[PDB]
Ligand binder design. Structure first.
Ligand SMILES: Nc1ncnc2c1ncn2[C@@H]1O[C@H](COS(=O)(=O)NC(=O)[C@@H](N)CS)[C@@H](O)[C@H]1O
Ligand SMILES: Nc1ncnc2c1ncn2[C@@H]1O[C@H](COS(=O)(=O)NC(=O)[C@@H](N)CS)[C@@H](O)[C@H]1O
Ligand SMILES: [Mg+2]
Ligand SMILES: [Mg+2]
Ligand SMILES: [Zn+2]
Ligand SMILES: [Zn+2]
Lengths: 463, 463
């Protein structure tokens, strides 16, 4: 049911067009692009406080790519290779970046010299490529991740790296809270961690179909990469030690989830700061004081633009009904309607998208009325969102009880686990599910092997 | 001399790092990225008035790519090819986009149906790839054009297309005028036009080394592409005619030229709206009322931020001299200095980057003082720039006189030309130069063959 809804809204709302001749590569249409744009504005406000945006190349030579032990093994046959430059075959294969460690790190080796240089915090929003699963899904599992934001940091001590991991987590929390997206934070199992990292922390959110979606990862790379690419720095004493690195990223999934989670029957419902328009003015006219209604709307639009609003005056010549439907299925938060009546009273009708509540406000101080409504809409959407997710995280004491809950109610399943490979693998195989990760807490007994369970773990059917 | 200057400033000002293992692919460092960012902000303000930003894929399948007669011939061996997806060879070669006609047009065939749909105006800023000349030059001739802005339009009548070409030209004029970049507009010879177009209009600017740089092109594609990809539309009568298309683009060259043209001995000099910082506050202190000087600067910074300025308070602990040098070689327009004296008077020293003129202003209304200075700096830079270019465009009546001027003074050479292939080719071969394009005007006699010359043409040594 959700799948169909999603695919249809992506088309109706004109977000992406999937009819491109190459599987897993979609087109961002005007409207979709605007949402993506606003989502990135929000992200960058946060990231630009302490990160420096850069932009590295797309192509990586075998030499550099296969320079890592496990990392290269991790993306072995998941990499696209350019072999020819025109008719002639390149004397050195070039891979489209799957992620940029092998692109930036050799360069980091040069930029880093003294401890005065550290810490360094960079990020870029580029397009990456991954040749994976025959199962292609819009914004969720694409071959061309068109909105891959990857941040990479460099530190003097391992201590600072761990500290950075904590900061990244807080940055994502804030990012997501701004999109009203709920999340579960866990430490992925050591066999699912980013190829070559010390450990991976992941953010997972729940899709309306009971399936889970990884919407963010933070990795503590320790110094394994530093040693590989020779990223050393001079200490205040005169010694030469390797650096401690971390990296974290998000993809188009963040947009998929903002669409999916605040999804609706009427179409899209979006956080005010993400919608293409925050306020759409719709004039109601039947050839009766029209000239005065129109000039009341125009006055209003200009007044809102100057106030900092992303407003749109829909003066098209169609029935107000159709207009309502359109801007509603497109996710516009507030609709301001103006008719002869209310006009001859100095007021207008303001309709919310999340609730449907129409109120009456004085065009005189409407700016503040709108700002407040917007703050309200996000809080509501974020709240609802959190309730819906938590109400889907259920505890299980028996491995059999887990199977019953997953298969019947879907959602996330909480449980105490010993934290052993074989036991975890067995759990996954038996329940045909995936262990998202752990969260350290009081002990107990592993739901599967009964041994001492140091971790609170979660599992679910994932994307 | 210029070459060395350019390369050194790109490094000193930390714009791009060329030390990447793959020739023709450079890295945008933090500072460079900020300039690129601001340059694009300026561009988008203009383009977003009547264009809709989109984002298409990077990869194009042979099927689509080689679907055009001349277009495919034009980028035959200039295209990079991905042949393998992991270890397995793709059953369909994929080319990195050189430009996106073959990527978007098949998709345009679907989006276009009724005349009510037209006109459509799109654009995107993506990275494109071109395997060309062994001669790689930073921001001027790269394999990965990291800042390729391509706009594509669709029209019902050929008349509107030509009209669009005129609009594009005006858009670029405004873009460039904002960067204070001077330009010569001409109609490229029919053998240099964009592969498959009806005709190409190009913008050329002059580099400090007397060489010319193409910084923008507009193409009228007529309906040749429409027929190729089947982009038809229903007329108000019920007929099905093809569409009229145009497309135009810019690359990183725009940034190269803003750096080069307003170049300087002290380093970078940039239009206020392009610099990473428009105002850098430098407090002068020698342990004498410091606490009061610092709090005067902080107060000022905040005050400027809230006014809309991109300001930076350099409170580092180094000699004010070094600070001056740094922000000067980096292109910061205005430097605001505050010391005990001026402070105890309610004034500060404002230094211009283009001139070096230091003035004294009341911290009380400094906001306006700064805004005015910024407007002034651009006008000055744009003016100077235009003078320098025009003073390098020289007329020639004899083909021999041309050779003397080019070889001795470089620059651009104006001349009357018959407009024939063979004559033009001959001119180029004999003068070892390139014919930029023509400009229709009163007749005369071709500088080479003496026949009737309908066109005013220009030539020069180019990049
Ligand atoms: N095929 C895909 N389609 C869409 N999003 C994806 C895809 N693969 C991964 N992602 C998203 O991108 C994020 C980062 O991917 S990753 O492999 O975990 N980590 C990185 O690549 C690290 N180098 C951090 S920059 C994931 O958390 C996930 O939300
Ligand atoms: N290798 C290159 N490096 C940097 N800039 C380039 C390169 N090749 C072309 N350009 C710049 O990019 C602009 C557009 O390139 S073009 O081939 O003339 N035209 C297009 O590709 C058309 N499809 C318009 S979008 C040129 O005007 C030129 O200024
Ligand atoms: Mg697993
Ligand atoms: Mg030529
Ligand atoms: Zn166990
Ligand atoms: Zn001639």
């Amino acid at each position: 049911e959700f799948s169909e809804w999603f695919h249809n809204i992506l088309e109706e709302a004109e977000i992406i067009d999937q009819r491109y001749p190459v599987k897993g590569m979609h087109v961002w249409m005007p409207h979709g692009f605007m949402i993506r744009k606003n989502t990135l504005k929000i992200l960058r406000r946060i990231l630009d406080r302490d990160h420096e945006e850069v932009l590295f190349p797309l192509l990586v030579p075998e030499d550099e790519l296969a320079k890592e032990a496990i990392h290269v093994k991790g993306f072995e046959d998941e990499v696209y290779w350019v072999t020819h430059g025109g008719l002639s075959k390149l004397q050195r294969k070039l891979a489209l970046r799957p992620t940029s460690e092998t692109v930036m790190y050799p360069m980091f080796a040069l930029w880093v010299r003294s401890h005065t240089d550290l810490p360094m915090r960079f990020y870029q929003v580029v397009n990456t490529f991954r040749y994976e699963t025959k199962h292609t899904r819009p914004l969720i599992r694409v071959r061309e991740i068109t909105t891959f934001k990857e941040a990479h940091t460099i530190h003097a001590t391992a201590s600072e790296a761990e500290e950075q991991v904590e900061r990244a987590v807080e940055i994502y929390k804030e990012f997501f809270n701004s999109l009203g997206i709920p999340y579960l934070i866990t430490r992925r199992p050591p066999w699912d961690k980013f190829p070559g990292s010390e450990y991976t922390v992941a953010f997972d959110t729940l899709m309306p179909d009971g399936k889970t979606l990884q919407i963010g990862t933070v990795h503590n790379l320790g110094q394994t990469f530093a040693r590989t690419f020779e990223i050393k720095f001079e200490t205040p004493e005169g010694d030469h030690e390797y650096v401690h690195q971390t990296c974290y990223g998000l993809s188009d999934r963040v947009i998929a989830s903002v669409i999916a989670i605040h999804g609706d029957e009427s179409g899209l419902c979006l956080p005010p700061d993400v919608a293409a328009h925050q306020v759409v003015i719709v004039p109601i006219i039947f050839k009766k004081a029209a000239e005065e209604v129109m000039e009341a709307c125009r006055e209003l639009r200009s007044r809102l633009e100057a106030a900092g609003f992303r407003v749109h005056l829909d003066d098209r010549d169609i029935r107000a009904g159709r207009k309502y439907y359109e801007w509603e299925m497109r996710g516009v938060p507030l609709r301001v309607e103006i008719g002869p009546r209310d006009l001859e009273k100095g007021a207008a009708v303001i309709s919310r998208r999340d609730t449907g509540e129409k109120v009456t406000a004085d065009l005189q101080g409407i700016e503040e009325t709108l700002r407040e409504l917007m703050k309200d809409i996000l809080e509501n959407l974020r709240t609802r969102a959190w309730e819906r997710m938590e109400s889907e995280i259920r505890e299980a004491e028996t491995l059999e009880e887990a199977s019953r809950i997953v298969d019947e109610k879907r959602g996330i399943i909480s449980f105490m686990w010993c934290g052993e490979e074989e036991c975890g693998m067995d759990v996954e195989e038996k329940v045909r599910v995936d262990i998202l990760g752990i969260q350290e807490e009081g002990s107990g007994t592993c739901i599967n092997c009964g041994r001492e369970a140091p971790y609170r773990a979660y599992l679910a059917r994932t994307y």
